[PDB]
Symmetry: D2
Subunit: 386 residues, 4 copies
């Protein structure tokens, strides 16, 4: 087959297969899953680990003894299966108190509470061995213009991230942060709407080396953006700390379909990029099995996430290893793209007449790039017609 | 009226009112405009200056004496009118040689030529007194995945920008660079697709202080993004070096409608932001009078750009100066957004029981944000119903 | 200013002001509203009527005796205020049994249950005085290709609507049906995604005269379509039976902002069309008070809906009434557009040398359309700068 | 592998391979192709026929004698290769006289000239054997609200199409007309923007049986709509007279990528629908070889169109033929979907206690639809992992 094993580093959040199907126009179609039950069936499917929001593991408003009790049972299922916890995050979007945001809520007291709720879950994550802590600011934003002064809201967002950075620094924790962008939903527009806005923001933080991004396929596609290109810019910057894989069919509400569904060619170019750049983190799936499905359809969907990644990995490796493709890449001058434009510097370039006054503009313009032949070769490989 | 005068700093490119109406499915509907003729009618409309692509002023492939001749006549119309040239740029997209890009073309020789063509126009811009040099990489991108390795293409883009930065440094020129983002068109996806991706890229340049962004209203809207929010993040970073104003009606081809058309409420929040943050650069219009129009419709459209900015400036100033609005802003706690979340630092925050263990979550959650009242106040002011 | 009266016939759904605020990523921020409180509060706001889904009025699962009690409570409040009930609809989307649809579910027994639930509410709506019954097939569709054969699903959809028409015909009821299109959400793709698809479908029912459309501003805008142009096509067809007004800020999840918010110029062009076409049905607002709001924010938002419709009505009447505008329209040849192209038939046209042989194409091509001056006059009227 | 033959009836427009590459921001990258070279080259590629706009074949402005010479040259090449001409159309969008439209221009004389230009090419198309004549009203629309009264424009559009039907009826021609929808570009909004709007319009013409639609993959996707679902509705209506195949990577400018590129899974679902519905018309490709390509890239791209259609045909036949799939379909109750909801009428339905009173809603709600396993089986077939 294309069978997962933990070496594939496939991970899933408790809230993915655990989604009960409650949406904006409909009630839950499935019962709540026990986290222990999820750890056991994911290990049987070939998964390497699980991730969690604090409120996915410990129900909101738990007493301290109830909390110890929930953390205990989960720690026990983990130990018995060999499953790891590579990443964790905080829910700063479900409770009504976060209706205007967490870190950038207009009310000062909710911002402080958002910070304490996050620090408590960071202590727990480190204990369970997580090395990345994600922040998805889903309620940071606005539906209307005067409701949020975005320059002041970015001051408060930077304040919170700097505060968390000094906190993990004083404790000597080995954990880093990853910002998860999303352009809209549940808010009209969300602050730091794309991988680019998140990367630019991090450069203004006090300790920038502590923070990176955790891009999600469907989010960048909700802005009509090219997800493989955004990932290539995060890898060029040395900031791809983690990644969430799923599917989306266009610019519409966030679907969280299983990976491979939605834009299939972009899932092929994404796998090709992650494998050839040697990304070594978790291949995390942040998807929601459709609410039409019962619990068997939930595990069939999660199995399909891992399967589609292993089929696409195989076809992309076969495409880059093919002699005919290597030759087509040379024909489209991808080798010359790797050459410096002007390693001898600006003074030699200005003195070079072949670069301007003697350049044959029309002879260069008539060279076809042979890109369509190359792309049909990539299509034959993806489709297994070679 | 709402009459422009040069104090308003309104500027226009030679290619805007000069557009002949040639589009992907149709030929030109208007004759070419003489640049001198454009300088004279813009000064009569109340404009402060004009901008240009090299090939808008000096037709491609001019001989050196033809070039001196074209630069002469234009310099003469400028002097006789008092019009300034605040900005200039290079056309690295119209000639067939640039069909795979300029700075990131796969062919090494075209990249060198792209750099020499740009340096020649930088010398001319400085002479005419321009203080900002724009780069719009419209052909930097791809329609297919293997045709452009984006990590290597970002190396070549950084190489070119660093080369231009050492060039203006050695010459002692007082000019800075501004990157103009666009998500797609004419290419399938364009590198540095949004204000965020451009800001993140600049932080990886050798002399980052030399570069900023020049956002265009319609471009960010072609990705469904909020343009006032993107401008607020460029102002927060200290990188809004210039701005292009126009209109767009949604996610579709780039329309370049006159400013005020398209999303009218976003043009209101944009003017409110630029005026209250005290932006001091040109209010440049990069628009195309519809090809249904004759030359009188061309000057009526350009006049409407300046008029809509002066009406929106008036209504936004009236909105922020209204006592009822100041009170509604206090009611929605925009004042508390300006307070530091935790100026006493993380140790006091962790010791503060009112922040977590004694926080009344439900009492805070029931506080309405009063945002709808605030936004109807902004709507009454925009519409002049107060 | 601008107060709503009775002949304006603004109406609101029980579910609009009654939205408690739970969305895909969060829980309710408001308590449930008793329908009689909504009838009273809306009567005091100047509303002329209320509409309802069956389950907004009678909780799902109610016994025939609890049903009777909720209905008696509701008709007392109507009786006491003089509020009308112009339209009603069925909830065939919330209960998990409708997870794959109502009328086009794959399970035959769920389809029969859908039709019995609908027929039961039709009888109720008729005695209350509603003359329009709406269908919004929100769950009719799929997230994947083989899950629904769309030709067979359109035979089931037609069969359902024909059975409904047979039933109102046998009972002698005066009621007409209106289909409300939506392109996606909660399903990946919904059947009859736009006004055009719903109009074309009606033409295939056995009694087409019983069916029309109930378009919603936001829904056509979720496909990036022009909502005023869609409504002109439904009015051209004789099928605008009802309309839902609200706002949407682009292609993204369905926002249901209050009327006037979102695309403000499309709202002016819509009110200009409806008022100049003499539409006489209800002006119904199907919107959701943002969950950031308490109940005072809910009534402020609902009042804002009516106010924005009246300001835009005044501004559009002023635009059409201005002699400079009526002159601008003649300059743009909108009067020549109402002349028949060739009222004397195709033989006359063929014989006419001035229509081809002797037509002066270049003179005709050089005529400007003067559309920009005409649109800036409309901009000055909407903004009250005229 | 996979070679095109004659009974596949792949056809191409003279304008597709003949695209010289000038786009809104750049000049031609290729020389013009002589039509007889295109007929010969396409015959050698395995194409069954060519289509044409009048001005692709006879340059605009030609004298009746130059016209005769281009037509004689073209019919010799067809005669010599055995290539057919299944469809033809009129260019009513390039010449500046059509800047405001053809059939719905505001100038009455341009509308009459539009109809004479069309009638002249209809006579030509009939003697060549075309049985479908396409209309793409690319300039019919507006960029602003008062520039076009859409109800009067639909009376002019209907008047034009009725005059065309009167003309083919009087001549006894066997030709049918097909409308090709497009939502926008080159106009801000185009009239009859989708398959649904065009279908609904046809129903209002005097002879509806003479008119159907010619949908294009990319155009429905520019509105974010599901192209397989639109085509199933046109087939349900009896109106899929012709179809244009290509690719589009999202909501943006009209790309016209080769067939298979863009949304690859929508292309599989389209070929599965067309082949299982037994569509018999041409498989026409209306695409543009990217301007990065020389002429060898143009023929590689055009061959790729046919190859992708044949691979997807094989993969969809294999999916429908697999017993595990046909079992999965029964598990998802696609067979219950083809059963009448209530073939014994509405009195039987009303009397049935098992349809409402005694219906076990919770048992029915708990049934899983098994749609994910069925879609991963379709994913494995498209990818040849089965
Ligand atoms: O759109 C929803 C987000 O992607 C959500 O599922 C986040 O992943 C989670 O809050 C942790 O990052
Ligand atoms: O979409 C087109 C671009 O906006 C173009 O008009 C640039 O403005 C110009 O090349 C200079 O920046
Ligand atoms: O997207 C939601 C629909 O618009 C819904 O609110 C309908 O209004 C209702 O079911 C009656 O048509
Ligand atoms: O957007 C462009 C249209 O698709 C055009 O290529 C039509 O195919 C042609 O005019 C016949 O309909
Ligand atoms: Mg998501
Ligand atoms: Mg632009
Ligand atoms: Mg809605
Ligand atoms: Mg097209
Ligand atoms: O998500
Ligand atoms: O532009
Ligand atoms: O809605
Ligand atoms: O096209």
């Amino acid at each position: 087959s294309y069978q997962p094993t933990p070496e594939d580093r496939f991970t899933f959040g408790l809230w993915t297969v655990g989604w009960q199907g409650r949406d904006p126009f409909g009630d839950a179609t499935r019962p709540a899953l026990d986290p222990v039950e999820t750890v056991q069936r994911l290990a049987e499917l070939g998964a390497h680990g699980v991730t969690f929001h604090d409120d996915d593991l410990i129900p909101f408003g738990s007493s301290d003894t109830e909390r110890e009790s929930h953390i205990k049972r989960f720690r026990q299922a983990l130990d018995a299966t060999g499953m790891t916890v590579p990443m964790a995050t905080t829910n700063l979007f479900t409770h009504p108190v976060f209706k205007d945001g967490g870190f950038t809520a207009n009310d000062r007291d909710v911002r402080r509470y958002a910070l304490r709720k996050t620090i408590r879950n960071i202590d727990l994550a480190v204990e369970l061995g997580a090395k990345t802590y994600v922040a998805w600011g889903g309620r940071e934003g606005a539906e209307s213009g005067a409701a949020k002064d975005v320059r002041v809201a970015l001051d408060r967002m930077k304040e919170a991230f700097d505060l968390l950075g000094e906190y993990v620094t004083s404790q000597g924790y080995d954990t880093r942060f990853a910002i998860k962008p999303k352009p809209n939903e549940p808010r009209g527009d969300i602050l730091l709407p794309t991988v680019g806005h998140a990367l630019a923001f991090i450069e203004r933080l006090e300790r920038p080396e502590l923070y990176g991004v955790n891009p999600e396929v469907g989010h960048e596609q909700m802005a009509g953006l090219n997800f493989p290109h955004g990932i290539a810019q995060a890898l060029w910057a040395g900031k791809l700390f983690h990644i969430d894989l799923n599917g989306q069919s266009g610019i519409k509400y966030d679907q969280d379909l299983r990976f491979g569904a939605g834009d299939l060619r972009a899932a092929f170019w994404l796998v090709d990029l992650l494998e050839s750049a040697g990304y070594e983190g978790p291949r995390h799936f942040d998807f929601k099995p459709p609410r039409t499905e019962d619990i068997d359809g939930v595990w069939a969907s999660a199995a399909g996430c891992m399967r589609n990644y292993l089929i696409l990995k195989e076809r992309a490796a076969a495409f880059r290893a093919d002699p005919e493709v290597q030759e087509a890449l040379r024909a489209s001058r991808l080798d010359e793209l790797a050459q410096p434009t002007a390693a001898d510097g600006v003074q030699e370039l200005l003195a070079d007449r072949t670069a301007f006054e003697d350049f044959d503009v029309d002879a260069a313009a008539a060279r076809g790039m042979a890109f369509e032949r190359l792309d049909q070769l990539a299509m034959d490989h993806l489709l297994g017609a070679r």
